[PDB]
Design a protein around this motif. Structure first.
Motif: not given
Lengths: 547, 9
Positions: A379, A427, A436, A438, B1-2, B5-6, B8-9
């Motif tokens: 991560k 993913f 994304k 922004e 943004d991600v 995606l964090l 949801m793992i």
């Protein structure tokens, strides 16, 4: 009496050749005399090593023409050569003048011929902690290394005994590194290719490269390895460069799983510290040789280099760059993309029952037996490569070529860590195509250059196999729908890019896995002419490649 | 943004 007959310079003639009667007598018979010296060995070698400063070539030929016969008839009177060697390797203090300064070179070749014989006729025995004449012969070898008088080809049979000299600790190893560096910087070309092909300079240089490859090919050392890799890194490419690659794949699979960590971590420290030099050489270690070594068959599952790179990768990744200066910036950026390449490959050839399950790798990553999924270090990796390729240059115009290659290497790490260690399509859009917007935070502007004109010679020749493809197209195009009898009877740098391979790897995995949203995004980005020509052409070549 | 995606793992 026979030794007194032999060690004498008496001149004869067939005319103008002079041919000493020690030499001529040792030429005529040469073997039964050596059986007599076999009959009494001890006084023969002790008396034979009495005159060893005048009759140098004589007694060296005596030893060579005795060990050749003691080597060839090893099938009778056995258990002999070991006692022979362990007797004779005791009195090399008798020799002090054949190899020293102001001494003939042919005698030096003769010393190393005695060396080649005592390390061919016998085994690895006289090597450990002053076993025999090792510290009385190693200095002769060192004075034949540090001399300014040996030859560019007559060291060719003289370097080849480093297999019998890579079995040590430090102390003499430092001056071994010294003599190897000084012979390299007085015997190798400075950067690349500055010698005419065919001539007996460049060819003895490629013979020198070949014998280095022969040496470390068996003798698995990090000792000779950074020494050779420093000349493997002094330019972008070299003249005999594939031979190093074949020998690196050859040294990769030998067993010795602990020594592979030694090679990786040692050339990793040769790379890793400050060492102010030029950045191509300062990164080409991890750019070429380390990747190509640890890729093939180094160790199928290794977590010791991949245990210290836990400590030693993310510390460089999670950083700040100082952009007052370039010479602090580019070193950090190059070692950062080296770490991207290392974790890329380390997730490329690793399975899942050791790293991304609740295993000893993540127990090495954080201190304690983890109940967590194993997705903590990955991560921090995934977040920081996402930060890396989504790092804008909204005013930034310093070294943008390196940041482009950096961004693409960052996404290479991302592609590798996402294509390998999980199985869900969440993913597979969410970190690869969910970009994304922004303010500026898209993908391809930031990781693709977009800054030149691709120059095309057109279709220059060979439309040979493609005509049959077109006729097979007209086979399956009419005969499937409304086939008559026949009908008509009438009468390259986008690939080699460091960009095309991971995309055409990831989609050619993404097919054989399960309108998708990523298909809609690349559906729109190809027909939108505000988007540049560059990634339009590149995703076109993508779609052409992944049919 | 991600972080979508964090979580949801």
């Amino acid at each position: 009496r026979l030794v007194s007959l032999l060690l004498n310079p008496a001149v004869l003639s067939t005319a103008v050749i002079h041919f000493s009667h020690g030499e001529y007598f040792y030429s005529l018979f040469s073997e039964t005399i050596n059986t007599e010296l076999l009959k009494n060995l001890d006084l023969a070698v002790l008396e034979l090593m009495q005159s060893s400063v005048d009759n140098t070539k004589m007694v060296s030929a005596v030893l060579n023409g005795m060990l050749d016969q003691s080597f060839r008839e090893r099938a009778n009177q056995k258990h002999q050569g070991l006692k022979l060697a362990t007797t004779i390797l005791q009195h090399w203090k008798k020799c002090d003048s054949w190899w020293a300064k102001d001494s003939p070179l042919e005698t030096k070749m003769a010393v190393l011929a005695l060396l080649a014989k005592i390390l061919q006729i016998d085994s690895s025995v006289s090597f450990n902690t002053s076993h025999g004449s090792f510290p009385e012969v190693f200095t002769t070898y060192i004075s034949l290394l540090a001399d300014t008088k040996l030859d560019l080809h007559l060291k060719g049979q003289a370097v080849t005994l480093l297999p019998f000299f890579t079995s040590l600790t430090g102390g003499s190893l430092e001056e071994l590194r010294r003599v190897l560096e000084q012979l390299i910087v007085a015997h190798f070309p400075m950067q690349s290719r500055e010698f005419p092909p065919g001539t007996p300079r460049f060819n003895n240089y490629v013979d020198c490269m070949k014998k280095f490859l022969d040496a470390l090919e068996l003798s698995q050392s990090p000792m000779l390895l950074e020494l050779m890799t420093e000349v493997l890194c002094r330019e972008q490419q070299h003249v005999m460069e594939e031979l190093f690659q074949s020998s690196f794949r050859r040294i990769a699979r030998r067993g010795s799983c602990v020594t592979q960590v030694g090679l990786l971590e040692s050339v990793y420290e040769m790379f890793r510290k400050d060492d102010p030099r030029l950045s191509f050489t300062r990164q080409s270690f991890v750019d070429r040789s380390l990747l190509t070594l640890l890729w093939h068959c180094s160790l199928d599952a290794l977590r010791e280099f991949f245990s210290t790179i836990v400590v030693d990768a993310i510390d460089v990744l999670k950083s700040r760059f100082t952009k007052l200066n370039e010479s602090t910036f580019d070193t950090q950026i190059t070692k950062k993309m080296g770490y991207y390449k290392i974790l890329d490959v380390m997730y490329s050839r690793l399975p899942k029952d050791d790293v991304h399950a609740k295993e000893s790798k993540i127990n090495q990553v954080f201190h304690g037996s983890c109940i967590t999924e194993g997705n903590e270090l990955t991560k921090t990796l995934i977040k920081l490569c996402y930060d890396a390729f989504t790092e804008n240059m909204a005013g930034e115009n310093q070294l943008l070529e390196r940041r482009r290659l950096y961004h693409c290497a960052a996404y290479n790490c991302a592609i590798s860590v996402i294509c390998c260690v999980f199985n869900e399509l969440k993913f597979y859009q969410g970190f690869l195509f969910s970009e994304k917007p922004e303010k500026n935070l898209l993908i391809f502007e930031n990781l693709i250059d977009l800054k030149r004109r691709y120059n095309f010679p057109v279709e220059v020749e060979v439309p040979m196999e493609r005509k049959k493809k077109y006729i097979e197209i007209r086979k399956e195009a009419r005969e499937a729908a409304n086939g008559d009898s026949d009908g008509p009877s009438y009468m390259d740098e986008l690939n080699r890019h460091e960009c095309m391979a991971p995309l055409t790897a990831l989609v050619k995995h993404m097919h054989r896995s399960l309108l998708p949203s990523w298909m809609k995004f690349l559906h729109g980005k190809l027909g939108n002419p505000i988007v540049p020509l560059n990634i339009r052409l590149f995703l076109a070549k993508l779609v052409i490649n992944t049919e | 943004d991600v972080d979508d995606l964090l979580d949801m793992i």
